[PDB]
């Protein structure tokens, strides 16, 4: 009754639905806590990440850096494969993928540069060939430059700069953090206070309005205690903006319009600690002495409830939900609550290979100085136990185990982890994604299915900027691990393969293993 190709198409349709039923983040990070890790040696074929190459800082940048009179700073434009260095009032960009790069110098600025960022342009403003806007903040003003990052035959963007006549006086508030939205909105913050500013700009000059303006969205007044920002974070999928303060206060702002920004949540460390105390498992790794060192937004495509990850200096990952009071009038949330905690692993890095309760006391990630999360959960933590050498903890969801876990009530935040050692003197500065953002589906269910996209998009790669160079870290897929493991079985017995294969079956299941 039903011919071959139609029968096989039925199998495809049911297989597509099976891959798109991969558990969403909310489902395996339910209220509670977890310490589930399988640690892998960095030199192992089972390593979830590994360093593929490194790019030294050009010698000319070292000449300028050591010629610094007062202030210097480094940063990453990982989206286009560029890095930058500021020396006092001078800025230098370069393509770090190029073996002998030329330095793009920009020295028009009159005062010390305090922040630099590469953001999308405002639509309908610039010629289509302008791909980005370069924001340069000094102690006196903020400067906008047009950017065209067109790809070259070699695979590294060609960068040319355009003047704009767009600039505004800074004012009294320091600018150390610049972030941009998908639509080209530019937000500013710094180390003077917790105020958030926005830069507006338009093509036409008017007699009653300049081409470029600046406004303070915080509208402060009266008595104000000392407090400033540690970072700004954007989530376009929810039209939200987050700030982290030096007191570990998390503020949430909603973009109710193309020119509006409204503060909708303010959650201090005490509130986080109160939520934590109401959880079943309390821990000495999170107290009133603990600092939150970084935030990472979680987009709505990845999870409905969990909006935000917060990293403590003890290495705890705090996952916070946010909820609106109502269901209709984007809808702004009005509450934020600490729901789930991923506690640190226990295994420390070792030169020699060393040999079920919730582990809520590990110090392996203490102190955590910098932290980053990328969908579907790739986690980088800069652990600074010693003041000269950084250790990099890198982990990923155990996609294979999460996909096979049954029933749904048994789902936990299983992870594969590893330690990547940086040489003595390497101080990590920034980590950015070099490939396209990960997404296996368009909604939380199916979103995190790494297995499904092994052959549709290249493995994620991450540029780790240090004070000596840029290191490229690459995510390894099942097929990469399987191929590497088999490569070690080439010189062994019939039973040597069967043993290695059984490791894969016990983690990924038989079908996924045979498919690899």
């Amino acid at each position: 009754a039903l011919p071959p190709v139609a029968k096989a198409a039925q199998v495809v349709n049911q297989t597509l639905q099976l891959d798109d039923s991969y558990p969403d983040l909310d489902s395996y990070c339910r209220p509670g806590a977890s310490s589930d890790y399988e640690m892998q040696s960095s030199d192992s074929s089972w390593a979830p990440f590994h360093v593929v190459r490194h790019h030294n800082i050009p010698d000319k940048v070292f000449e300028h850096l050591n010629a610094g009179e007062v202030f210097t700073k480094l940063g990453l434009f990982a989206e286009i494969g560029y890095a930058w260095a500021s020396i006092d009032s001078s800025l230098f960009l370069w393509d770090y993928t190029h073996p002998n790069p030329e330095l793009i110098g920009y020295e028009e600025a009159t005062h010390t540069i305090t922040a630099v960022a590469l953001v999308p342009p405002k639509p309908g403003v610039f010629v289509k060939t302008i791909t980005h806007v370069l924001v340069v903040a000094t102690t006196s003003e903020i400067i906008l430059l047009g950017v065209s990052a067109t790809p070259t035959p070699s695979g590294s963007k060609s960068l040319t700069l355009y003047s704009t006549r767009m600039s505004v006086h800074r004012g009294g508030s320091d600018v150390s953090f610049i972030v941009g939205t998908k639509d080209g909105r530019i937000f500013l913050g710094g180390e003077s206070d917790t105020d958030i500013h926005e830069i507006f700009y338009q093509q036409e000059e008017r007699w009653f309005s300049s081409r470029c303006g600046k406004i303070n969205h915080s509208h402060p007044f009266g008595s104000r205690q000392q407090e400033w920002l540690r970072g700004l974070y954007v989530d376009d999928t929810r039209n939200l903006l987050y700030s982290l303060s030096n007191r570990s206060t998390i503020r949430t702002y909603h973009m109710e319009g193309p020119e509006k920004l409204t503060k909708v949540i303010e959650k201090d460390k005490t509130s986080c600690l109160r939520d934590f105390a109401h959880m079943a498992d309390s821990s000495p790794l999170f107290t009133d002495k603990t600092n939150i060192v970084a935030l990472s937004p979680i987009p709505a495509t990845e999870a409905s409830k969990l909006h935000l990850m917060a990293l403590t200096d003890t290495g705890c990952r705090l996952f916070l939900s946010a909820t609106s009071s109502a269901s209709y009038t984007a809808l702004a949330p009005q509450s934020m609550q600490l729901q789930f905690v991923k506690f640190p692993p226990r295994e420390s890095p070792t030169r020699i290979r060393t040999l079920s309760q919730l582990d809520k006391t590990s110090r392996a990630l203490d102190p955590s100085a910098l932290g980053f999360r990328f969908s579907p959960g790739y986690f980088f933590d800069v652990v600074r136990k010693h003041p000269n050498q950084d250790m990099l903890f890198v982990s990923a969801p155990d996609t294979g185990r999460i996909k096979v876990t049954q029933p749904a009530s048994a789902l936990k935040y299983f992870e594969q982890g590893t330690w990547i050692e940086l040489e003595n003197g390497n101080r990590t500065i920034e980590i950015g994604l070099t490939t396209a953002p990960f997404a296996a589906a368009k909604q939380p269910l199916g979103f995190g299915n790494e297995l499904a996209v092994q052959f549709d998009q290249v493995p994620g790669e991450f540029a780790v900027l240090t004070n000596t160079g840029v290191h490229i870290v690459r995510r390894r897929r099942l097929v990469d691990i399987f191929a590497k493991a088999l490569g070690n079985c080439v010189s062994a017995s019939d039973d040597a393969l069967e043993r290695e294969v059984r490791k894969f079956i016990n983690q990924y299941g038989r079908v996924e293993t045979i498919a690899a």
Binding site: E102, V125, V127, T160, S163
Partner: peptide, 14 residues
């Protein structure tokens, strides 16, 4: 080498 800054005329339309 100081980067050549092409003019605003090309940059913004129309």
């Amino acid at each position: 080498r100081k980067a050549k800054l092409l003019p605003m005329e090309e940059a913004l339309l129309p």
